[PDB]
Design a protein around this ligand. Structure first.
Ligand SMILES: Nc1nc2c(ncn2[C@@H]2O[C@H](COP(=O)(O)OP(=O)(O)O)[C@@H](O)[C@H]2O)c(=O)[nH]1
Ligand SMILES: Nc1nc2c(ncn2[C@@H]2O[C@H](COP(=O)(O)OP(=O)(O)O)[C@@H](O)[C@H]2O)c(=O)[nH]1
Lengths: 43, 201, 151, 480
């Protein structure tokens, strides 16, 4: 149980890092749709 | 090139008629005229083993054309395999264009890559074969090179019997069966496309 | 590329012009038939088989005149054909591949099979390819080549 | 426009919704739009059976059915109205196509229709600052990628539009350049002798960097003097004033204040004058290249065609209103038309005064017929590559400070020519190509960032799997 608790403590910071990465991925996804719209406007 | 017991050429014309004639006239029927029956196809008949059940078809020169391959495919069909002939140059352009050419359509599962003209040059040749090995696994069995015979007394280290031996050792039936399976799958795919369009409407 | 736009337009113009607007080698029958067949085929939505038939009729003007020998129960047509050929072939009827007498410089036979393949072979073998077998490629047609004028 | 569609599809017209169903707005270019418009109910079967038309429609994602053809025509016409994609160049293309399809009705409708607001440069600035914002966001979230993004932004910020301008000498180019800049610069007085190239650029320093011939360029000029027999005379007149004592390798004079001694026959030794001036016109990151017409053939013409064949992103050619086609000018325009790289250069009829309006149009028609006569094939339609304007520089220059303070700025054409040049900074192909390149760069840097950031998540997942495996091994050890 102790090893699991230590892994949970580390998996708090690890969870925060994973959530940040997920938000970065969502922002990049938004960016690609925006870029496609910008391309569409051109002619 | 098909098999016979003697040397012939059979010139099939555009208008439907053909003529069977002596092979010496081949050049005459290759070179076009203005209003002489334009030849639709040329059929060399020769008494060579390996023309028994594995006949040969000559293809055009690949004049640096990205859309050449699809047009060729549309022109001419069922091909079970081929022999890709290339000079010492094996640059990235040849690799990429070979990939778009063969693309499982025209050459590969078993088909051969052949470097020509060893005689004008080894460590260099060794390096080139290694390059071909990891580069050209598109084609299946080993990449190969050479060519000199016929007024060579040796008749060999032209590896020519290696190419010949491969051409002999092909399991023709397997090639035919796999080709047929592929084509039937293609047709099924097309039919499904059409059906789903209707369903969508 | 606006130059490429103009070139694209010009290419379209040339292609339409070549497909629908051209007069043939007229002043002679050979291509008056082509003009008539073109008349028959712009919108008058033709059947593909009609289209092919018209194409074959167009070709027929460039081609071997086909003349056929019509025999009776057994009126000796085969011996007449042999006489025409000079050499002889099977003078009893158990019957029939369609057979052709064409011209060459030697005596050989060309056996076109049903599966699409053909073979060029010796004229002596003609009889064997006439008479049926059980499980070898049935011939679709027989093409005798002989060095006779009139062929 | 239901009446128009009834006119062109009399009985095969279908039930259709008159609005642009268009999905991309760049789906097809203007020549392809013109082709689609010329699928009038009398040619439609032939077009549908034509292989090249089928290939075109497969490129555009169209069918060959009648309904979809008519729907596409609708959408094209609504884009012509609203998004205003087509100029009179669409009408040009339909006139070109009238070889095949005598489509008069659609031509007339396109002619007589209130067009729309145009709004080009504002849209350009909006899209470009959109892309700048996207680049900034990418920079926020790696150091190599951020440096790459910064370099890309530096490249696409304030970048190099080069205008070459040419013409024969008496026709007059320096005076037109003065009027465009709205003050004076080198030369307003006609002189039979001449030449050196002049590059008007923008910069904080106000240099006038000068370049003379090399030893070898001068040797070539003296070689050609043997053949020209007017250059030989001029070279004999020049060598009396021996300024040779203009030599082997490098001549870079850095500054001058409008010294007119070079007009005393020394400019023949100069080839290239590189100016860095302060004019708001050039403050928009423009650079102009003035070019000689006929003098000092040997290498001044070679350097002219170097400067023009180099960067120059546009070509303006000038002819005076009353020149009889100026055979050298005509040969140059022919060379322009055959060059497939040129892509719709421009013509200005300079000195729009001194000639009655509606007679200027006849002059332009004569010019175009001559150019067509030099190109006998469908090649003729290449003359529709040229745009024609009719500007007079004297009236515009007068309005600023001179005699005609009463309004000659309009009724001259300088304002419209200026509008045209500014429009070529979105409407011109170069600006759109640069925007496309910037978009591709942003997509590729985005792809790199995705590759960077997904791998961290993959590594975290692998670490979690390893931790789970270690826990399972510990449980197995406890059981043992
Ligand atoms: N006595 C005689 N026999 C003939 C004549 N014409 C044909 N025959 C014979 O008729 C037999 C059959 O000839 P064949 O060519 O097979 O007739 P086919 O079946 O109609 O082609 C042969 O034995 C010939 O010799 C003839 O004019 N007189
Ligand atoms: N009416 C009129 N005359 C002009 C105009 N521009 C130039 N000129 C005259 O045309 C001649 C040639 O002009 P110039 O400045 O020398 O151009 P350049 O020969 O290319 O250097 C000069 O005599 C000018 O006075 C103009 O806009 N209107």
């Amino acid at each position: 149980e102790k090893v699991l608790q230590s892994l949970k403590n580390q998996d708090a910071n690890i969870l925060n890092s994973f959530e940040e990465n997920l938000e970065k991925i969502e922002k990049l996804k938004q960016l690609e749709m925006g870029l496609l719209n910008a391309d569409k406007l051109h002619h | 090139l098909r098999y016979a017991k003697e040397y012939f050429l059979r010139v099939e014309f555009e208008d439907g008629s053909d003529i069977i004639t002596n092979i010496e006239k081949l050049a005459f029927y290759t070179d076009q005229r203005n209003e002489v029956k334009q030849a639709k196809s040329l059929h060399i008949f020769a008494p060579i083993p390996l023309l028994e059940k594995i006949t040969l078809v000559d293809t055009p020169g690949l004049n640096a054309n990205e859309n050449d391959t699809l047009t060729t495919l549309d022109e001419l069909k069922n091909i079970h395999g081929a022999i890709w002939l290339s000079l010492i140059d094996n640059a990235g352009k040849k690799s990429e264009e070979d990939a778009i050419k063969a693309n499982l359509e025209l050459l590969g599962e078993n088909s051969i890559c052949v470097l020509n003209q060893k005689d004008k040059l080894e460590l260099d040749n060794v390096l080139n074969y290694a390059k071909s090995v990891f580069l050209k696994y598109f084609n299946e069995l080993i990449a190969i090179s050479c060519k000199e015979a016929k007024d060579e007394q040796s008749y060999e280290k032209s590896n020519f019997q290696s190419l010949l031996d491969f051409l002999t050792q092909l399991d023709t039936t397997v090639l035919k069966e796999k080709f047929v399976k592929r084509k039937i799958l293609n047709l099924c795919e097309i039919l499904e496309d059409e059906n789903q369009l209707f369903v969508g409407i | 590329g606006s130059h490429m736009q103009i070139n694209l337009l010009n290419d379209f113009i040339k292609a339409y012009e070549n497909t629908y607007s051209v007069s043939f080698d007229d002043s002679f029958k050979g291509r008056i038939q082509e003009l008539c067949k073109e008349l028959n085929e712009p919108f008058m939505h033709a059947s593909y088989a009609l289209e092919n038939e018209l194409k074959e009729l167009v070709f027929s003007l460039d081609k071997n005149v086909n003349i056929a020998i019509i025999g009776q129960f057994s009126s000796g047509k085969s011996s007449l054909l042999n006489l025409i050929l000079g050499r002889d072939c099977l003078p009893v009827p158990v019957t029939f591949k369609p057979t052709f007498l064409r011209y060459a410089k030697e005596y050989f036979l060309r056996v076109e099979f049903e599966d699409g393949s053909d073979i060029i072979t010796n004229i002596e073998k003609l009889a064997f390819y006439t008479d049926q077998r059980n499980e070898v490629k049935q011939a679709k047609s027989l093409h005798i080549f002989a060095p006779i004028p009139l062929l | 426009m239901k009446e128009l569609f009834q006119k062109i599809w009399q009985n095969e017209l279908q039930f259709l919704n008159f609005d642009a169903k268009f999905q991309d707005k760049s789906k097809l270019d203007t020549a392809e739009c013109a082709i689609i418009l010329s699928v009038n109910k009398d040619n439609y079967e032939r077009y549908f059976l034509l292989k090249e038309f089928q290939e075109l429609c497969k490129k555009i994602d169209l069918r060959v059915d009648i309904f979809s053809m008519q729907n596409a025509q609708i959408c094209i016409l609504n884009l012509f109205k609203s998004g205003f994609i087509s100029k009179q160049d669409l009408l040009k293309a339909l006139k070109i196509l009238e070889k095949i399809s005598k489509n008069t009705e659609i031509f007339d409708f396109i002619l007589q229709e209130k067009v729309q607001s145009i709004d080009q440069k504002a849209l350009f600035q909006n899209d470009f600052k959109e892309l700048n914002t996207i680049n900034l966001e990418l920079q926020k979230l790696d150091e190599n990628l951020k440096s790459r993004l910064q370099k890309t932004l530096e490249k696409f910020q304030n970048l190099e539009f080069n205008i070459a301008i040419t013409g024969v000498m008496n026709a007059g180019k320096s005076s037109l350049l003065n009027a465009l800049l709205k003050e004076d610069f080198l030369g307003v007085s006609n002189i039979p002798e001449t030449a050196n190239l002049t590059v008007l650029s923008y910069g904080k320093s106000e240099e006038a960097k000068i370049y003379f011939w090399d030893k070898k360029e001068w040797q070539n000029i003296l070689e050609s003097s043997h053949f020209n027999a007017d250059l030989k005379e001029f070279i004999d007149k020049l060598d009396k004033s021996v300024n040779i004592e203009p030599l082997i390798q490098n001549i870079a004079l850095c500054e001058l204040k409008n010294f007119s001694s070079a007009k005393n026959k020394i400019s023949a030794l100069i080839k290239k004058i590189e100016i860095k001036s302060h004019l708001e016109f050039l403050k928009n990151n423009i650079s102009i290249v003035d070019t000689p017409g006929l003098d000092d053939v040997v290498v001044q013409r070679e350097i002219v065609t170097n400067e023009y064949l180099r960067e120059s992103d546009f070509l303006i050619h000038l002819m005076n209103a009353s020149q009889s086609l100026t055979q050298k000018d005509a040969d140059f325009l022919v060379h322009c038309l055959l060059n497939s790289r040129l892509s719709k250069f421009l013509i200005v009829l300079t000195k729009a005064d001194l000639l009655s309006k509606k007679d200027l149009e006849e002059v332009i028609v004569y010019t175009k017929e001559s150019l067509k006569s030099r190109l006998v094939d469908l090649d003729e339609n290449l003359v529709e590559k040229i745009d024609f304007l009719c500007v007079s520089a004297k009236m515009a220059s007068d309005f600023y400070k001179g005699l005609a303070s009463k309004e000659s700025l309009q009724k001259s054409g300088m304002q419209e020519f200026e509008n045209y040049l500014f429009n070529e900074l979105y409407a011109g192909e170069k600006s759109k190509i640069a925007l496309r390149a910037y978009k591709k760069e942003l997509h590729l840097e985005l792809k790199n960032i995705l590759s960077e950031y997904e791998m961290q998540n993959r590594l975290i997942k692998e670490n979690k799997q390893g931790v789970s495996e270690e826990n399972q091994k510990l449980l197995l050890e406890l059981q043992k």
